[PDB]
Amino acid sequence: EQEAHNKALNQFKRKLLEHRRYDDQLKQRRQNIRDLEKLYDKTENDIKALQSIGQLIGEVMKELSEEKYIVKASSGPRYIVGVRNSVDRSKLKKGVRVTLDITTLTIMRILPRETDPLVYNMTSFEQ
Amino acid sequence: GDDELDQEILNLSTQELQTRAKLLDNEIRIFRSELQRLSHENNVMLEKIKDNKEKIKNNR
Amino acid sequence: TGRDDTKETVYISSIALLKMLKHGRAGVPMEVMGLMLGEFVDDYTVNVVDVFAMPQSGTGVSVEAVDDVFQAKMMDMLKQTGRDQMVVGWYHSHPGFGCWLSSVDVNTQKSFEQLNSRAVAVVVDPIQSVKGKVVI
Amino acid sequence: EIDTILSTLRMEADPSLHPLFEQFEKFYEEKLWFQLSESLTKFFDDAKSTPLRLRLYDNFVSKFYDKINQLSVVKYLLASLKDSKDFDESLKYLDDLKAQFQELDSKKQRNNGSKDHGDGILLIDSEIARTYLLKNDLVKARDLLDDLEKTLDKKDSIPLRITNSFYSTNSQYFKFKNDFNSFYYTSLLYLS
Amino acid sequence: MSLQHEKVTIAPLVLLSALDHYERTQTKENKRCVGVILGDANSSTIRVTNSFALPFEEDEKNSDVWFLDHNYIENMNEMCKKINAKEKLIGWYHSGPKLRASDLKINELFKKYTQNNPLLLIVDVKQQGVGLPTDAYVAIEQVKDDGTSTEKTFLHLPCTIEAEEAEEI
Amino acid sequence: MVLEATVLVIDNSEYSRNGDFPRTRFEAQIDSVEFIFQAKRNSNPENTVGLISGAGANPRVLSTFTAEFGKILAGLHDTQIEGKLHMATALQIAQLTLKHRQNKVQHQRIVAFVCSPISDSRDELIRLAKTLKKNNVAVDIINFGEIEQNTELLDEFIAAVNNPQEETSHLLTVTPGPRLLYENIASSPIILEEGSS
Numbered sequence: 001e002q003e004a005h006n007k008a009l010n011q012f013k014r015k016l017l018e019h020r021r022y023d024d025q026l027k028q029r030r031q032n033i034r035d036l037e038k039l040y041d042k043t044e045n046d047i048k049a050l051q052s053i054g055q056l057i058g059e060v061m062k063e064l065s066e067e068k069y070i071v072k073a074s075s076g077p078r079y080i081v082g083v084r085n086s087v088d089r090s091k092l093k094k095g096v097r098v099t100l101d102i103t104t105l106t107i108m109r110i111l112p113r114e115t116d117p118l119v120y121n122m123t124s125f126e127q
Numbered sequence: 128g129d130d131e132l133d134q135e136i137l138n139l140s141t142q143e144l145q146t147r148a149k150l151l152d153n154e155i156r157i158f159r160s161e162l163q164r165l166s167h168e169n170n171v172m173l174e175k176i177k178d179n180k181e182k183i184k185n186n187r
Numbered sequence: 188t189g190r191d192d193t194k195e196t197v198y199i200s201s202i203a204l205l206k207m208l209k210h211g212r213a214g215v216p217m218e219v220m221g222l223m224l225g226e227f228v229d230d231y232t233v234n235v236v237d238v239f240a241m242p243q244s245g246t247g248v249s250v251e252a253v254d255d256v257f258q259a260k261m262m263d264m265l266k267q268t269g270r271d272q273m274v275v276g277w278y279h280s281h282p283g284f285g286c287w288l289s290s291v292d293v294n295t296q297k298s299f300e301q302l303n304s305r306a307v308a309v310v311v312d313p314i315q316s317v318k319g320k321v322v323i
Numbered sequence: 324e325i326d327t328i329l330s331t332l333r334m335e336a337d338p339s340l341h342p343l344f345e346q347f348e349k350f351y352e353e354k355l356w357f358q359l360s361e362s363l364t365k366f367f368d369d370a371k372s373t374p375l376r377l378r379l380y381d382n383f384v385s386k387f388y389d390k391i392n393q394l395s396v397v398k399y400l401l402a403s404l405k406d407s408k409d410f411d412e413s414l415k416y417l418d419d420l421k422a423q424f425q426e427l428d429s430k431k432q433r434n435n436g437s438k439d440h441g442d443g444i445l446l447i448d449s450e451i452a453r454t455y456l457l458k459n460d461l462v463k464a465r466d467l468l469d470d471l472e473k474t475l476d477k478k479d480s481i482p483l484r485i486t487n488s489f490y491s492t493n494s495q496y497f498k499f500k501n502d503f504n505s506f507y508y509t510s511l512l513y514l515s
Numbered sequence: 516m517s518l519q520h521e522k523v524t525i526a527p528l529v530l531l532s533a534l535d536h537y538e539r540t541q542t543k544e545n546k547r548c549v550g551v552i553l554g555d556a557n558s559s560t561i562r563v564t565n566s567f568a569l570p571f572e573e574d575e576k577n578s579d580v581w582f583l584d585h586n587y588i589e590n591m592n593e594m595c596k597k598i599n600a601k602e603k604l605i606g607w608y609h610s611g612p613k614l615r616a617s618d619l620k621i622n623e624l625f626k627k628y629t630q631n632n633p634l635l636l637i638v639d640v641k642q643q644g645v646g647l648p649t650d651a652y653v654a655i656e657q658v659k660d661d662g663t664s665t666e667k668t669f670l671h672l673p674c675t676i677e678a679e680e681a682e683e684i
Numbered sequence: 685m686v687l688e689a690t691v692l693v694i695d696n697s698e699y700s701r702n703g704d705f706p707r708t709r710f711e712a713q714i715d716s717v718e719f720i721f722q723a724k725r726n727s728n729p730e731n732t733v734g735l736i737s738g739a740g741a742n743p744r745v746l747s748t749f750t751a752e753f754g755k756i757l758a759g760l761h762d763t764q765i766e767g768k769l770h771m772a773t774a775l776q777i778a779q780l781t782l783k784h785r786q787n788k789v790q791h792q793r794i795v796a797f798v799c800s801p802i803s804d805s806r807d808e809l810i811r812l813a814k815t816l817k818k819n820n821v822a823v824d825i826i827n828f829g830e831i832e833q834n835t836e837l838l839d840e841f842i843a844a845v846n847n848p849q850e851e852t853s854h855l856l857t858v859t860p861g862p863r864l865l866y867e868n869i870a871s872s873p874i875i876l877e878e879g880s881s
Contacts, residue, residue, distance in 0.1 A: 012148035103317075178593075182597075201531050260594065479516050
């Protein structure tokens, strides 16, 4: 050694490694809570999904009055159903796939038209 | 180490290096508070994962 | 013998009925569950004050779908505000069937009856309350 | 130290304004930095038309940026550059401090747990636009004001100082163009 | 944040609930009750689905002094999240006869949990008037032409009642 | 002692961003909070301590009583350091905080830091101090902000509370110069605090 008080700097060299390894641990855990976050988001979107119920499709077969509509459900038997204020009369028209509820049986919203599962194979084989 | 060694016996005086070490005591005390806070927060977090995923497991 | 030994006439409060229906209606078609909270006076008068629902399952109503965690913890919430009483029974929903206990729920009622022998089961039809009459 | 720079200001000023500077120093030695914010405000009310105001502030940015309050510094910066007849200089100062927060809040927000530096950022942006309006580059000033307005409304709750400075640049712009109508409504917000 | 509170539809369930909690804490003689409001937001109509009581002791020396449990709030919310996951903090109900200016400071506290602008729903437990026992208000910031700076103040919201199909029957 | 519930009032001011103690004063108060907590827990685990702040301009509860120091510590992270503690409102809320617990087997103890020059009217705080003594509440006033530049009004209140009691108020005077606030309070009685019966 140069000095016999470098025996005391061996002790401070030791603390120096500690303080730079606690700086490296604070940004490690902030990277591990960011991992725990995505996995917490990944399962929290599933909670929102599981508590949602399904809807049953029909189409506007015929206007009945103003608020009453004949739909032909994709279950097959026709029903009479209601409207929310979400739809309008002029957004409904015949041959439009509309959703229904399965316990209220009201049109909530307009849907684009159905399309067979078969015919997507045909649009994706040209090879 | 790039501070407080035989490199710094040349560069700086050793009684500055005696006061340097008691300042590294100060800042590792501030960093020690911050580490335990982030452990505690990951302990709350892991159980909020288990909460959500168990529900999924019944439907699975 | 020595008592009236008859099943309570269940007086469901103004709050409760609506709460069970809102709870059940959202879950249609899947079966719903929950507890009735109430108080027991006369040998046949149980007034049901409030309700809380026990979370959903992927196998619907089971004895298994009871979770002591949810039940006790939610109870401890009410405890701090002093609106908890005691569990007088439980409700669950058969919207695919009429009012009567399915094969499973009888064994569930057995366990509940062990704990408290005034335990009732109330079957709610949220799907036949689209009438002017509530089926309960 | 700072005494030697401060002494030059002490000489030029009135003998009745000399004791004020001594008090600034007295607080700095004690390391009471709230007391120092109070003492600095005094000089600026009755002398911001002096160039001694500018000099005083320059030194204090250097030796106080986490010691006296963050707000006080930026508010002083707005005042400082109305007293500067230089506009190139104005741009330099504004950008130094805006850059300085950017790196600084990465360390500062976690270690204390709270102090927001985006409050200063807005006060700074308002001063940039103000400079372009004094330079009379009216196309550049205006398009910076559109961007700033969108940003102000995003922040939920607006300190009155920030929105007071925004309404000043709008007042200046409209009375250069001599739109009497646009001036009138903005100025009711400025007086309120 | 925003104003989207143009309509407030209130489930009848919540009104009945409010009176029940008020009595089961037995807050009388100018004591108050505060509970959370759970429901939807980001819609021009604000839907009041549910409420739950929070423990809240309100002083009698002053109106500026109160106890409110912040830790309690999250626990109530995560449980109810399990029931239905469309419920978030949308405000808090005050059950006083009428409006106070010490509710403004409480409003600010609930602004932390919300991602909307807190609804103060003064649920009257005195059933005064032949019309609604609800007035609604939201705390909003304004300046005004008097010379008044940065006011926080409550703007009345027209009150309406909607109910679900199961609820109504 | 032990079997003691303690409410921490943390002062939030701009006298606590001032150099009085290595770094800022606000950084020292964090270590102090943890030190208090660990002492009371280590002696007996049926000790719980919570934290209220003067942040905002009307004190808010951060954490109720808990055996988890990570809870007290996470809530100190959430702060406003421009807020202002008012003493008269903090004593009243703390009294109500003490009335909100899970079991009433614990003594009533408040430890309030004071970091700002007190500017609340004396006359009112005579009355508050005399309310504590009929609730069997003690209050431990740590002065290192009032010494610095202000008349000593908190001293007279401590004498007012003193009666034969299970827990009785104390005055601890902590030096405002740099001697490590956390070392100083640790050496002052915080677990060997007596009654006066």
